[PDB]
Amino acid sequence: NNQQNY
Amino acid sequence: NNQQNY
Ligand SMILES: [Zn+2]
Ligand SMILES: [Zn+2]
């Protein structure tokens, strides 16, 4: 799983 | 932000 918070 | 992968 991937979560990216820019 | 929230991501939960059960
Ligand atoms: Zn930011
Ligand atoms: Zn699972």
Structural notes for this entry:
The PDB classes it as protein binding. Keywords: Keywords beta sheet, glutamine zipper, asparagine zipper. Two copies of one chain form a homodimer. Chain A has 6 residues and is low in regular secondary structure. The first copy, chain A, has no helices and no strands. Chain A is rod-shaped and about 15 Å long. The N and C termini of chain A lie far apart (16 Å). Chains A and B meet through loops of A and loops of B. The structure holds zinc ion (ZN) (2 copies).
- Could you tell me the strand content of chain A as a percent range? under 5%
General form of chain A: rod-shaped
Query: Count of DSSP helices of chain A?
Result: 0
Beta strand count of chain A? 0
Ions, cofactors and other ligands present here are: zinc ion
What is the makeup of the main sheet of chain A?
A: none
Show the largest interface: A-B, 3 and 3 residues
Proportion of residues in helical segments of chain A: under 10%
Structural class of chain A: little secondary structure
- Ends distance of chain A: 16 Å
Oligomer: homodimer
The radius of gyration computed from the alpha-carbon positions of chain A, rounded to a whole number of angstroms, is 6 Å
PDB class: protein binding
Keywords: Keywords beta sheet, steric zipper, asparagine zipper, protein binding
Assembly: dimeric
Entry title: Structure of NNQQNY from yeast prion Sup35 with zinc acetate
